[PDB]
Amino acid sequence: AIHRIRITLTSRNVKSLEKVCADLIRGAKEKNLKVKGPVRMPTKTLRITTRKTPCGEGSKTWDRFQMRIPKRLIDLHSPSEIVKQITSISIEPGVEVEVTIADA
Amino acid sequence: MAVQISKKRKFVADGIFKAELNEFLTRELAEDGYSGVEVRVTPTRTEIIILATRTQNVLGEKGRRIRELTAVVQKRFGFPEGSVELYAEKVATRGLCAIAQAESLRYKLLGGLAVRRACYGVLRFIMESGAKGCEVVVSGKLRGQRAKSMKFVDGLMIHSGDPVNYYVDTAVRHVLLRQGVLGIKVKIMLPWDPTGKIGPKKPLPDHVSIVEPKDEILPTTPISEQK
């Protein structure tokens, strides 16, 4: 075995991240062990501000190009089964999943 | 390798890789009606579902073309031997995708045809397919030294709001001809408002559906019952 696993869920789509995030809670609590539920980091807003205009002219209008990236993370304690079950299931959309070994 | 590229600078990169594909893919599987990839990253592997139409051409000689494109994507964005499998699939109801039809109109003109009869042939189709509405614009010089702009329209179309963003299927494609350059713009309206399966939101937020009294029979004298 039982080691200090962190699962770091980073994705853009809040809804398609929190269907996965819920399935790891409900996937672990099925075969119960521990957790400390989903952590909510500040959402990072990737904000670009370019001119609307190609070339010069016209009254100066710009767009406000944004991309969000919310990070959840979920602590757990398990063997090399429950990790390799819970991570490989509940994948699919534009969702990145990290797996820390223990502590550091 | 031990870079760990940033959740800021990484999703940007995979957005970019996404874009870089969807262009060469568009620009090479054009005559075959590329609708779109949906990039499918996995363990040990990077699936990449090429959602196009006429799959007899993406395969080619016994499945050569698919194997070229796999090799290409191996040699470009850095995907080792057996770490990338393309997966060509046919588009469901190709009338309702925009760039499919917009390309079908780059090549219907390119082939040699009037604007008029062609774009109707498109516009006819996309409605008949099953659209809430649609429009096509063929800007550019059109049998005259001067530039015209032509716009043949049919059915319903919302032209503002967030709603637009997940409902219309916009698609611009040029067309390079023996003269010069026209623009296609296909802009279809999706009637997944009726039945996506669960059509996203479904309501255009304006639209409310009041389910009707259904029963509400009987005032009557009192009575009782037992069970």
Place this chain on the structure above:
Amino acid sequence: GFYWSHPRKFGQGSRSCRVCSNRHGLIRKYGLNMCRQCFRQYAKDIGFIKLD
């Protein structure tokens, strides 16, 4: 094969648009290196969606 030599290492000598090799109004930030137009083309595809 010799001579074609300077700092092509800093200065806009070095950096150019990844899409079209034009060398102005360049979105350096965030490891893009697109020209500012080549945003609005390759933008939705990237992920930057116009919200407010």
Place this chain on the structure above:
Amino acid sequence: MGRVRTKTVKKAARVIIEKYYTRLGNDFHTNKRVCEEIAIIPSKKLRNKIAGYVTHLMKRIQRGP
């Protein structure tokens, strides 16, 4: 000034009442989520905004038809 009602509301409102006179009353927050039951109002603003006339037409009805 800010708020006069739109015909998506004025029409839906009037049509709920035509069909559920008995279900509604002269409160807001009751008939407020009656509308959640008997209709598919997507947005909370509208859902909520609709119980607007649902009341303003009961206050009319008791006084007159």
Place this chain on the structure above:
Amino acid sequence: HVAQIYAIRQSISKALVAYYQKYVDEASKKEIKDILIQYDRTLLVADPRRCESKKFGGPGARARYQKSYR
């Protein structure tokens, strides 16, 4: 600097209000809440306000970079 003060004013009037309410009484809570809200200065009321954003084509929210004009 200044904000931090109606912040701490509001806090030791609110806190003191929740004091006499939760365990102590209510009459004194109400005699307090009266004594305060007969002149607020947003004592128990959060000032609902917060700053506007800047919009392009102006130094602040509203004002605009001077119009050239022939």
Place this chain on the structure above:
Amino acid sequence: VTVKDVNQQEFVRALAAFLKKSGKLKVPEWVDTVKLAKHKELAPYDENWFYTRAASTARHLYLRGGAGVGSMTKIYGGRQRNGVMPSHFSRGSKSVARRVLQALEGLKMVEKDQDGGRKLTPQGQRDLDRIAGQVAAANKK
């Protein structure tokens, strides 16, 4: 009556006095010809900053558990006319905040902490706020 309980600006007034009336600290030579920070226009009038600034610096460390030279420079700031230019923020002089720290170190008001940065040592912790009692109890006013 800690450093906080004493009205903090008439703290360093008396703490400047302390380190003067001790007659030891280690006043040096860049002193009479010091700018104080490229920041400033002009060399300071009370000819005796660092008795009053080592006062500040040392009480400052009391309030904050750890502080580097880079920190001390930061804190004694200001605006800076580059002239017709707009004003910007320039760090204070390192040399002086440093030698203030090193000099406080001589009397052993302070020490180098673990994990980098100076903090004040128990001995100094005293001399500092001993006089806090003396500043409150100088008189109520």
Place this chain on the structure above:
Amino acid sequence: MLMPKKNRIAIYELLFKEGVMVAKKDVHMPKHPELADKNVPNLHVMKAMQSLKSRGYVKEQFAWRHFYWYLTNEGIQYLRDYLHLPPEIVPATLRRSR
């Protein structure tokens, strides 16, 4: 049948070894992933391949400054007869499928 012999004879036999040869449009690389025994960047590669297409023994795409060099069935002859290579040859697209 041209240019730096050592480099260009190797570029042919690279292209015959492979199904597809990608590149980049950049004269200033002194290298190119796989092969590049020595230098042979874009130029020596391009100069070769932009020959091959125009005569007809290769076909292009471009796609965000790169050159998408795809080997033509006629070229199979041109380059194997250039390289005296066996009359079976098997370039690269041997392609065990299913």
Place this chain on the structure above:
RNA sequence: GACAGAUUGAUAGCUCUUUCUCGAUUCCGUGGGUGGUGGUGCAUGGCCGUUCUUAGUUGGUGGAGCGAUUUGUCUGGUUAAUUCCGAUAACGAACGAGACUCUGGCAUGCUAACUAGUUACGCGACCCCCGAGCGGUCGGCGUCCCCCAACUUCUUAGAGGGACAAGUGGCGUUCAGCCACCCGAGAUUGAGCAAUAACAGGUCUGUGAUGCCCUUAGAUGUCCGGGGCUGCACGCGCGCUACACUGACUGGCUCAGCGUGUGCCUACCCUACGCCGGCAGGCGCGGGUAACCCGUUGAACCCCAUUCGUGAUGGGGAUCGGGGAUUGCAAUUAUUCCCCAUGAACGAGGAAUUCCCAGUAAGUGCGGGUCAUAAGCUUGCGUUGAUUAAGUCCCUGCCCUUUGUACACACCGCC
């Protein structure tokens, strides 16, 4: 494809002898390209600008006109808004507005969170009189933390709720609504999205989008070196800093937010803490795919502590003298910075004219963008935070209606 010199700028065999190798490349014609930040934005695509965040636009069926057309699409009240109701030859519909999205604020209501905070504990402590206190006890920063406290009071971000002219009193055709007040965020916190239809608006120099045209080796192909784009009797355009004492410089205290950061597509950061130096800086060393490190982001105004005395003075702070650092292979054409040194006009601006109503103008730094070097540029962000309109069409310009019109390149017309 050519290691010493004539040269040339160049160790450019680019060329004037010598020749020593790769060795089927080479060279010379012809056609033809291939580019070109060449040409043409009245040859075009896209994208943008705008008429124009202005209320407008359209059709099915009716009804009117032989028919272009017309009503529906409107006297009036209303409304931010042909938005609504109603009068109603129209009835019921569609796009724009609205609804929506993002956002911004009430949520001791929920789900939680060592990549937040933590909170307050429990306070178990170190703990020095840090301070109070004879001592018990207490006020308090720091830490000793950790944690198998406990929790979400603020932090964060998920689900939620709510606010909806909702109640009451006026006013109102007593409809549509408007006004006041109650509870409370009172119906409006701010953008994005934005129709029909336009316009030689702009863009070929954002586009491997490109029509045609030019040009095409002596090349307008690509560059090296330099130069220019910076030049200066004058003219205008957006900025900043001042004109000072509600202020100037001299102590000190002390309050963030949005970001941003390395290790990035080809050679490159963010920076904590040691010494050295005045300072630029320098030289030591440390954390940092980051809510951890920078970083309780320790700011300016601001706030507080002394000078000064209304002197073009200490404001101001230009123009030059001289040093010293840094970036850069190189700064001459002061690169950027520091250190000295000189030390200007301006004492509130002549004719005009833009900006806007609430957390608004203004000041005020600070990020971002631009960046090797670097901003007086913008775009965001708080922070300090006013005066005043809350209405009208008086000027300018916009909407409808009626009307006149010899205008329809539409009055910048026609004559």
